[PDB]
Amino acid sequence: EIVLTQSPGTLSLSPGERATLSCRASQSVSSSYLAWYQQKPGQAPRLLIYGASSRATGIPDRFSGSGSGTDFTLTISRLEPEDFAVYYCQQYGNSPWTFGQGTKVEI
Template identity: 60%
Template sequence: EILLTLSPGSLAASQGERVTMTCTASSSIRTSYLHWYQKKPGSSPCLLIYRISTLASGVLARFSGSRSGTSYSLTICSVEAEDVAMYYCQQWGSSPST
């Protein structure tokens, strides 16, 4: 089973700042099945980025995803108030999905 660790656990930013969060896998994820979800208060999680760096439909270009080894990053290049949310990473390249 692959353990995913997301850091930082929380962050504060001012509008317009660039923020990055990193999801580190305990071992290599087969293929590129690492995805990012955004959960806003009172809403269900929605897909933000899939397969490391592809933006889901309707997601603004200020969001981006990248990979370096077993570390996967989500960056918001110019954060807005509407980006206040919980962010989650998920892999399903290796069973079980985590």
């Protein structure tokens, strides 16, 4: 089974700063199968970046995404007051498909 460790546990950046997240993986996974989801409180998650490099349709260019092999990172340029949610990373390369712990971004 593939185990994903997401870091850091909690982020405390004031709005307008730069945000970084990491989704380290236990074993190598294909870069073509990895997704980043955003989860607002009491709402269904939505897909931000799929394929670890390509943004989804209708997404601002603030979210970039990068990394390959066993180290994947997400980068946000400027924190809009609506970018404070819980970010999950899911790999669906080989079964079973496992999510991440979740990273919380605060004010």
